[PDB]
Structure 1
Amino acid sequence: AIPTVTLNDDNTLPVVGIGVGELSDSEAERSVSAALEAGYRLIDTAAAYGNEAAVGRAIAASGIPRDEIYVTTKLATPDQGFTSSQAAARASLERLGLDYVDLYLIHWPGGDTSKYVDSWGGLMKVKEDGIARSIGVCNFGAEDLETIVSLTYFTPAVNQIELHPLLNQAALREVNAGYNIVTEAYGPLGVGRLLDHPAVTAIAEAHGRTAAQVLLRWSIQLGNVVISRSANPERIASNLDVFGFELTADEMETLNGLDDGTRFRPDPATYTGS
């Protein structure tokens, strides 16, 4: 019953998915299996997390037709390059045990414009070859976006960015929308630190819902595709259950008022890792 968004290349994605981040092989397989059983279809991993094969095993064992599942993975920063990115996409497929992925992203700008531009050209070939249905970016700022769009005339389908009430990304969301790029929010609970924020708990108590439900619903109402995570099968199911209520404009405004620039994940302006 999950709503979808339509991308600029005519493909569609669910508005909520599960990301595994740096979970160990065993934990990654466990959470993806639980998510699929609960009804998640958008699954997000990365080569840099080292757990692609584990995710692939959860998918293989699920008994769900491949066509119904939306798999995202990412180009690790050390693998950037025109030729190297095409090889890295194919290596990711081998690890995942898949013939294609649905979304393939540059993981970080990585602090070298030549290299991320070349990586983008590589990704365009990856898409042309049918290796990835859609291509996009993660943690790109407005200047990085202008650079790839200016030089290649090919616009990312998605820009996956850290986003939560302490870092609401209003400015970058507006840039994304102007280019017809979908915003994918990650880290929506702020490593769980936001679950006890008093503004969040007041709104949860007002609705008879949980803090986590409030944080995820707020992000959905901004128009984002929302990537969440839990290692617990019941909480995973609870994180999908965010279509039974709506936050009011007053409550949206309160949560929109909390931005203070807090990043729990690295800053892409500086970060040169993956």
Structure 2
Amino acid sequence: MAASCVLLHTGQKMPLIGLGTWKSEPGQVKAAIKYALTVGYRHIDCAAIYGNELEIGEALQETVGPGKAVPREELFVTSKLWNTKHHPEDVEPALRKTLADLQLEYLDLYLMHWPYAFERGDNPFPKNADGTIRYDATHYKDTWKALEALVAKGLVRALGLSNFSSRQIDDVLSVASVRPAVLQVECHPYLAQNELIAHCQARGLEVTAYSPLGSSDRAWRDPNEPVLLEEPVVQALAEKYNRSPAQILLRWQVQRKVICIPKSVTPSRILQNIQVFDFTFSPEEMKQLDALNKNLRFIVPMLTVDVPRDAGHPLYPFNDPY
């Protein structure tokens, strides 16, 4: 309880800062979880596809539960269902594998990672022939019903959506017996998602900003695109407040009640990342940061440098205006 929370429609308190775990590798992730929990983190964001749940599970078993440093009821754990696991028959075995890897009895939030499905099987990136992705045409509404059955089994407290557009979200609500509780999408001053955030508050979904720091060490990247953390306005607010640029980026979000999940393995950065509730931007400063909006998306799935992997798919979420 270093961080403040938001109330989900379920009644669960969701901390406004969580630890991101994308690219924290086995061999380092265990130390990150442990450091983050011990300095006050009560919110971990995970996914099967990140390939580190087995070692995250090792750290959680040591530190969380009856007899341990952290009670289980005070930890918010999120995971996500991968694209190969959209068929109703596969949703439950996928989740139980994640539960086993994590050594958990339940998840607090389970998200649908993408609205489109991949070919069923044990290959996370199944391919053709030409090396393009092999797709499966399971509709996200069918996946959603199968996810609801997990809530009934006590395996998950809340459900939600990742990389869904406003129309996909409303499509899900038209059939939802258990309403999604959270949308997780890319958000920061260059891609402010003001429209989609307003749409979510209308519908009772809370919003989690992924890549809240511009994800500065993503695996390829254009030479010529700006770096969010180097942004002049951000660097000058940093100096004004005696804070780091990352703290500026995160304060902007929690100030509008957007949940953030910054990833770090650096103990000093982990510490500072959750220390965003002791200062406040003036309306005019907020405005400066609201002026940076440029529709710059950093996280787009790519493959085979011999391209944008899914951009051409009919269910690709990023083609609508929001």
How far does residue 248 in structure 1 lie from its aligned partner after superposition? 1.1
- Structure 2 residue aligned with 1:140: 164
Do structure 1's residue 248 and structure 2's residue 282 form an aligned pair?
A: yes
- 1:21-32 equivalences under 5 Å are 21-32=22-33
Letter of the 2:20 partner, please give it.
G
- Structure 2 residue aligned with 1:213: 247
How far does residue 269 in structure 1 lie from its aligned partner after superposition? 8.0
- Structure 2 residue aligned with 1:225: 259
The answer on whether the counterparts of 2:21 and 2:29 sit within 8 Å (CA) in structure 1 is yes
Do structure 1's residue 106 and structure 2's residue 112 form an aligned pair?
A: yes
Letter of the 2:290 partner, please give it.
N
Letter of the 1:44 partner, please give it.
D
Counterpart Cα distance in 2 of 1:76 and 1:223: 27
- Structure 2 residue aligned with 1:170: 194
Counterpart Cα distance in 2 of 1:269 and 1:260: 22
Counterpart Cα distance in 1 of 2:200 and 2:177: 15
Instruction: Decide which structure has the larger Cα Rg and report it.
Output: 2
1:193-233 CA-to-partner distances (Å, cap 9, x unmatched) read: 32211010111112222111110000101211111111111
Q: Pick from 252, 263, 267 the counterpart of residue 297 of structure 2.
A: 263
- Structure 2 residue aligned with 1:234: 268
Q: Pick from 59, 72, 82 the counterpart of residue 76 of structure 1.
A: 82
Q: Pick from 79, 87, 93 the counterpart of residue 93 of structure 2.
A: 87
Are residues 67 and 240 of structure 1, via their aligned partners in 2, closer, same or farther at CA, if it must alter by over 3 Å? same
Q: Tell me, what secondary structure is at the counterpart of 2:148?
A: helix
- Structure 2 residue aligned with 1:18: 19
The answer on whether the counterparts of 2:188 and 2:249 sit within 8 Å (CA) in structure 1 is yes
Q: Tell me, what secondary structure is at the counterpart of 1:10?
A: coil
- Structure 2 residue aligned with 1:184: 208
- Structure 2 residue aligned with 1:199: 233
The answer on whether the counterparts of 1:162 and 1:265 sit within 8 Å (CA) in structure 2 is yes
1:138-160 CA-to-partner distances (Å, cap 9, x unmatched) read: 11110110111113354210000
Do structure 1's residue 121 and structure 2's residue 122 form an aligned pair?
A: no
Counterpart Cα distance in 2 of 1:95 and 1:264: 30
Q: Tell me, what secondary structure is at the counterpart of 1:167?
A: coil
- Structure 1 residue aligned with 2:53: 52
Counterpart Cα distance in 1 of 2:312 and 2:259: 24
Are residues 8 and 269 of structure 1, via their aligned partners in 2, closer, same or farther at CA, if it must alter by over 3 Å? farther
The TM-score normalised by the length of structure 2 is 0.81
Q: Tell me, what secondary structure is at the counterpart of 2:272?
A: helix
Counterpart Cα distance in 2 of 1:271 and 1:184: 26
Q: CA RMSD in A?
A: 1.9
The answer on whether the counterparts of 2:91 and 2:146 sit within 8 Å (CA) in structure 1 is yes
Point out the structure with the larger helix share: 1
Q: Tell me, what secondary structure is at the counterpart of 1:148?
A: helix
- Structure 2 residue aligned with 1:67: 73
The answer on whether the counterparts of 1:155 and 1:179 sit within 8 Å (CA) in structure 2 is no
Are residues 19 and 271 of structure 1, via their aligned partners in 2, closer, same or farther at CA, if it must alter by over 3 Å? farther
Letter of the 1:270 partner, please give it.
A
The answer on whether the counterparts of 2:197 and 2:207 sit within 8 Å (CA) in structure 1 is yes
Are residues 113 and 142 of structure 1, via their aligned partners in 2, closer, same or farther at CA, if it must alter by over 3 Å? farther
The TM-score normalised by the length of structure 1 is 0.94
